[PDB]
């Protein structure tokens, strides 16, 4: 359902000690050694919400990998009431 | 960007009304084109067309269709007029900067209907009726195209069409905000029209044996307001419309009701009443006898 | 003998029972019109004149041996019997535009009965006749049959049919491309409507039990029978006996247990 682009070559190569605040929100290429590793956790990709008044499943919403998404309006019953994520109908992503 | 569906017959009738406007000749000139210039010399807003002219072109067609489905075709006829004005009168399109509201007026129909002969199969068509005027109200402004502000975000949505009711926008235009219910109204930067209500009664000679007179409410807009006095016999040309009526709750019979279909919704209440009464909206008012 | 649930009617039985009588009817008797095939003159002259309504007297049938059953069945289940009787006609007409024109029957000789106020609740959905004087009638009321919906994100137009009074508003646009939740809007003047009028009748029965002051009745006339009655007229009316629950007040969806009564008119004399 989606194709990911990975850039292969890129001129400038940095060491971890050279980085400064002029490099923020920019493309970088670095070297190093891997010292620790965590397990595989799932991350929310296509999220479905429940309306706890009229029991409805609200459709796919996308997660940007920046901040958690929250809804506010039920289209069928017209409410801003409690809303909870449907774990069973959600599709997740790999994280490490 | 979703593709909007178009009415093919609407396009054909628009093209036909454009040919009607630009190619009519009477013993020789183009009368409507002359009136067009006449409206720049004095800054008017209304166009008066004669119905007998509509019939003759394309024997048995353009006029039959416009009369029978006026409610549908009116916006397309307005757009055609706009395109003709763009061509031969582009300075008139601006109020002396907002756009100028245009009104069309048909008259001189073949037949005049009695008040006690109006039926519900003529809803949304063009007809002419007669009656006696009893009561008039003062002129008040009417909401036509409104401006709304979002309450989650603050964006501006302008030129919302009301169409006989207080309509609100159903989707924030920003691809990010997901607001669909919460809006506020800027009454300073909204466009209004002029509105009056007239009450009419059946003529004395047209009442059946043993019965009492009937009444009807007439709505006037724009430049047609304040042409009818109390105690007059007038002829009205306009469109037969329906308005909500809560007085019918109590009459015998089955009263239609509305509900939302729950077949197809994934699950783990908004019933509205369809009660209406027949009213009349006028474009031409004439006082006869 | 398939029996429709809640009734004793067999549709095929009654259709075949009815077409033999309609193709053969008998009766100080003449030899010019009293001894001829009656109803095929009535149908032929109808189609010749360009007419759509057949007027069907009732006691015709309580003699002819077959259709006796049908008289009792017509005076007990008017809804189901009158749809059988129309299909006989439009079948019988081509048997003799007539593939797109609709036929109707109008019984006008139902008898017996002794007034509205002598009828019990066990007489609901039955055929009765009334006589009286007309006083008032409300102007025509538009009744919705087919509704019009517009998608406000794609401009796709849909039409819906009323089913026993209820309208089903689609939740999702039908276009395979534009599939939105709740995008359907109702445009009232694009809908199809029908006629309805309410009459008030001062009943004039034959038997008046001790101490009955006059009262008034409500009649509902639809479509063709509009403006067919004027105040001051002494009329005879055939129709069905109905009941309906009313709402306590406009704001609440609550109903009242005691029912309201009226008559659905089919024939007027
Ligand atoms: Zn809900
Ligand atoms: Zn917004
Ligand atoms: Zn749509």
Phi and psi torsions of B78, nearest 5°: -65, -40
* Nearest residue to C170 via CA among A56, B271, B260, B273: B260
CB pair distance less than 8 Å for B211 and C230:
yes
C233: number of CA atoms within 13 Å, CB side? 17
CA–CA dist C119, C243 (Å, integer): 12
CA–CA dist C81, C14 (Å, integer): 8
Total Cβ atoms within 10 A of residue B3: 10
Residues C160 and C262 in one domain: yes
| Partners of C181 in beta bridges | C172
Query: Pick from B179, B180, B268: which is nearest to A55 by CB?
Result: B268
* Nearest residue to B116 via CA among B200, B229, B198, B197: B200
CA–CA dist B27, C227 (Å, integer): 46
Taking one residue from A and the other from C, the number of pairs with CB-CB distance under 8 angstroms is 6
Q: Which of A53, A58, A62, A73 to mutate to test the interface with B (most CBs of B within 10 A)?
A: A73
Chains in contact with C, where contact means 3 or more Cβ–Cβ distances below 8 Å, are A, B
CA–CA dist B173, C104 (Å, integer): 54
DSSP type of residue C244: E
CA–CA dist C100, C91 (Å, integer): 12
> Apex CA B263: angle with CA C187 and CA C194, to 5°?
35
Q: 3-class SS at C66? A: coil
CA–CA dist B96, B35 (Å, integer): 19
Query: Pick from A71, A73, A76: which is nearest to B265 by CB?
Result: A76
- A54 reaches B (C-beta below 8 A): yes
Phi and psi torsions of A22, nearest 5°: -80, -10
Taking each helix axis from N to C end, the angle separating B8-22 and B31-42, rounded to the nearest 10 degrees, works out to 80
CB pair distance less than 8 Å for B269 and A77:
yes
Taking each helix axis from N to C end, the angle separating C78-95 and C11-22, rounded to the nearest 10 degrees, works out to 50
> Apex CA B36: angle with CA B30 and CA B38, to 5°?
105
* Nearest residue to C135 via CA among C213, C186, C198, C47: C198
CA–CA dist B287, C143 (Å, integer): 33
Q: 3-class SS at C94? A: helix
Residue appearing with tokens 């406000």? C152
Chain A residue numbers touching C152 (CB-CB < 8 A) = none
DSSP type of residue C259: -
Q: Which helix (H) or strand (E) holds A85?
A: strand A83-85
Given the DSSP bridges, would you call strands B191-201 and B126-136 parallel, antiparallel or unpaired? antiparallel
Calculate the alpha carbon distances from A50 to B129, B141, B170, B171, B179 in Å.
56, 45, 22, 21, 18
Residues C237 and C131 in one domain: yes
- Supply the range of the domain harboring residue C216: 113-269
DSSP type of residue A30: B
CB-based contact B213:B202 (threshold 8 Å): yes
Q: How far is CA A87 from the centre of its chain?
A: 15
Residue C21 tokens read as: 């009588």
Experimental approach taken: cryo-EM
CA–CA dist C121, A42 (Å, integer): 67
Burial class of B257 by CB neighbour count within 10 A (0 to 12, 13 to 18, 19+): middle
Resolution (in Å) of the shown entry? 2.8
CA–CA dist B166, B143 (Å, integer): 8
In this structure, what is the dihedral angle of CA atoms B123, B127, B133, B139, given to the nearest 10 degrees?
70
* Nearest residue to B133 via CA among B230, B264, B61: B230
Calculate the alpha carbon distances from B117 to C136, C227, C232 in Å.
17, 9, 20
Do domains B5-90+99-111 and B112-140+194-245+275-289 share one topology? The answer is no
Q: 3-class SS at A24? A: coil
CA–CA dist B270, A78 (Å, integer): 10
CA–CA dist A46, A1 (Å, integer): 12
Residue C217 tokens read as: 């009745």
Q: Which helix (H) or strand (E) holds C160?
A: strand C157-161
Residue B190 tokens read as: 């909204």
Domain residue limits, chain B: 5-90+99-111, 112-140+194-245+275-289, 141-193
CA–CA dist C93, C42 (Å, integer): 11
Query: Pick from B152, B178, B267: which is nearest to A55 by CB?
Result: B267
CA–CA dist B51, B237 (Å, integer): 11
| Partners of A94 in beta bridges | A42
**CATH code, B5-90+99-111:** 3.30.1640.10
> DSSP assignment of chain B, as one string?
-PPPP--HHHHHHHHHHHHHHHS--B--B-HHHHHHHHHHHHT--EEEEEHHHHHHTTTSSHHHHHHHTHHHHHHHHHHHHHHHHHHH-GGGGB---PBPP-EEEEE--S--B-GGG--GGGTTSEEEEEEEEEEE---EEEEEEEEEEESSS--EEEEEE-TTS----SS-SSSS---SS-EEE-STT-EEEEEEEEEEE--GGG--TT----EEEEEEEGGGTT---SSEEEEEEEEEEEEE-GGGTTSSS---EEEE--TT--B----EE--EEEEEEEEEEEE--
Binding-face residues of C in 88-127 toward A, CB within 8 A:
none
Residues C63 and C80 in one domain: yes
Q: Measured over all CA atoms, what is the biggest interatomic distance in chain A, rounded to whole angstroms?
A: 56
Phi-psi region of C255 (alpha: psi -120 to 50; beta: other; left: phi over 0): beta
Please tell me the distance between residue C158's alpha carbon and the centre of ligand 3 in angstroms. 10
CB-based contact B198:B228 (threshold 8 Å): yes
CA-based torsion, A16, A20, A21, A27: positive or negative: negative
Residue B70 tokens read as: 């006026």
Number of independent structural domains in chain C: 2
- B161 reaches C (C-beta below 8 A): no
Which ligand has the nearest atom to the CA of A76?
A: 1
CB-based contact C203:C216 (threshold 8 Å): yes
Residue B107 tokens read as: 């008259």
* Nearest residue to B183 via CA among B195, B170, B200: B170
Residues C159 and C33 in one domain: no
User: Looking at chain C, which residue has its C-alpha nearest residue A58?
Assistant: C181
Residue B14 tokens read as: 């628009």
Given the DSSP bridges, would you call strands B156-161 and B140-150 parallel, antiparallel or unpaired? antiparallel
Residues C99 and C120 in one domain: no
Calculate the alpha carbon distances from B253 to B83, C105, C267 in Å.
49, 22, 18
Residues C135 and C47 in one domain: no
CA–CA dist B246, B230 (Å, integer): 28
CATH superfamily of B112-140+194-245+275-289: Nucleic acid-binding proteins (2.40.50.140)
Residue C108 tokens read as: 């006008």
CA–CA dist C98, B283 (Å, integer): 42
Chain B residue numbers touching C188 (CB-CB < 8 A) = 242, 276
Q: Which helix (H) or strand (E) holds A95?
A: strand A91-95
In this structure, what is the dihedral angle of CA atoms C55, C61, C67, C70, given to the nearest 10 degrees?
70
CB-based contact C186:C147 (threshold 8 Å): yes
Last residue of a domain, one of C62, C82, C112: C112
CA–CA dist C155, B203 (Å, integer): 44
DSSP type of residue C124: S
Which ligand has the nearest atom to the CA of B180?
A: 2
* Nearest residue to B89 via CA among B47, B28, B29: B47
Phi and psi torsions of C36, nearest 5°: -130, 160
Chain A residue numbers touching B152 (CB-CB < 8 A) = 72
Residues C103 and C125 in one domain: no
Please tell me the distance between residue C148's alpha carbon and the centre of ligand 1 in angstroms. 25
DSSP type of residue A18: T
Q: 3-class SS at C194? A: strand
Q: Which residues contact A11 (CB under 8 A, 6 or more apart)?
A: none
Last residue of a domain, one of C93, C112, C131: C112
Last residue of a domain, one of C89, C112, C135: C112
User: Looking at chain A, which residue has its C-alpha nearest residue B182?
Assistant: A73
Q: Which residues contact C266 (CB under 8 A, 6 or more apart)?
A: C78, C106, C107, C127, C238, C239, C240
Residues C172 and C190 in one domain: yes
Residue appearing with tokens 């000139």? B29
CB-based contact B92:B85 (threshold 8 Å): yes
- B259 reaches C (C-beta below 8 A): yes
Residue appearing with tokens 């009654």? C14
């Amino acid at each position: 359902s989606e194709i990911h682009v990975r850039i292969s070559d890129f001129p400038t190569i940095y060491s971890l000690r050279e980085l400064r605040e002029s490099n923020l929100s920019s493309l970088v290429r670095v070297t190093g050694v891997v010292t620790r590793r965590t397990g595989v956790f799932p991350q929310l990709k296509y999220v479905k919400f429940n309306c706890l008044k009229c029991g409805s499943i609200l459709g796919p919403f996308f997660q940007d990998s920046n901040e958690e998404i929250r809804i506010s309006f039920c289209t069928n019953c017209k409410s801003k009431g409690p809303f909870r994520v449907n774990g069973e109908k959600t599709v997740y992503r790999n994280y490490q | 960007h979703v593709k909007k569906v178009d009415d093919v017959t609407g396009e054909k009738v628009r093209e036909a009304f454009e040919q009607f406007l630009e190619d009519f000749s009477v013993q020789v000139e183009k009368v409507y084109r002359a009136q067009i210039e006449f409206m720049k010399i004095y800054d008017l807003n209304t166009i008066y067309i004669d119905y007998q002219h509509l019939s003759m072109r394309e024997n048995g067609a353009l006029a039959m269709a416009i009369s029978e489905q006026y409610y549908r075709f009116l916006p397309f006829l307005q757009k055609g007029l706009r395109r003709v004005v763009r061509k031969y009168a582009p300075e008139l399109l601006n109020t002396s900067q907002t756009e100028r509201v245009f009104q069309i007026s048909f008259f001189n129909l073949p037949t005049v209907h009695r008040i006690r002969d109006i039926r519900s199969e003529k809803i949304g068509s063009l007809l002419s009726i007669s009656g006696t005027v009893t009561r008039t109200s003062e002129v008040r402004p009417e909401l036509y195209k409104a401006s709304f502000t979002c309450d989650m975000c603050r964006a501006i949505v302008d030129n919302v069409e009301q169409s006989f009711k207080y309509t609100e926008p159903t989707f924030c235009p920003n691809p990010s905000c997901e607001n669909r219910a919460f809006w506020t109204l800027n009454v300073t930067r909204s466009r209004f029209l002029d509105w009056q209500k007239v009450r009419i009664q059946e003529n004395a000679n047209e009442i059946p044996t043993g019965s009492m007179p009937r009444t009807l409410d007439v709505i006037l807009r724009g430049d047609s307001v304040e042409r009818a006095k109390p105690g007059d016999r007038c002829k009205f040309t306009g469109v037969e419309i329906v308005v909500p009526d809560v007085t019918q709750l109590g009459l015998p019979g089955v009263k239609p009701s509305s509900t939302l279909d729950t077949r197809g919704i994934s699950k783990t209440l908004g019933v509205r009443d369809l009660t209406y009464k027949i009213s009349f909206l006028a474009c031409h008012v004439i006082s006869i006898g | 003998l398939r029996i429709i649930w809640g009734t004793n009617v067999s549709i095929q039985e009654c259709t075949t029972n009815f077409r033999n009588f309609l193709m053969s009817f008998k009766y100080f008797i003449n030899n010019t019109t009293d001894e001829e095939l009656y109803y095929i003159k009535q149908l032929n002259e109808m189609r010749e004149l360009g007419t759509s309504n057949l007027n069907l007297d009732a006691r015709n049938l309580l003699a002819y041996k077959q259709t006796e059953d049908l008289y009792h069945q017509l005076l007990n289940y008017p809804q189901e019997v009158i749809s059988i009787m129309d299909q006989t006609i439009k079948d019988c007409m081509v048997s003799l535009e007539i593939e797109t024109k609709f036929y109707k029957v109008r019984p006008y000789n139902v008898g017996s009965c002794k007034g509205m106020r002598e009828l019990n609740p066990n007489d609901i959905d039955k055929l009765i006749n009334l006589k009286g004087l007309v006083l008032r009638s409300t102007p025509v009321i538009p009744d919705m049959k087919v509704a019009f919906f517009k998608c406000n994100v794609c401009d796709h137009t849909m039409a819906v049919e009323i089913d026993r009074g209820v309208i089903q508003e689609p939740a999702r646009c039908e276009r395979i491309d534009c599939n939105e939740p709740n995008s359907m809007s109702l445009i009232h003047n694009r809908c199809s409507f029908a006629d309805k009028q309410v009459i008030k009748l001062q009943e004039t029965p034959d038997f008046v039990p001790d101490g009955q002051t006059p009262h008034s009745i409500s009649l509902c006339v639809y479509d063709e029978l509009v403006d067919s009655c004027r105040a001051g007229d002494r009329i005879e009316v055939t129709g069905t006996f109905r009941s309906i629950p009313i709402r306590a007040n406009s704001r609440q969806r609550v109903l009242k247990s005691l029912y309201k009564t009226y008559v659905d008119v089919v024939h007027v004399k």
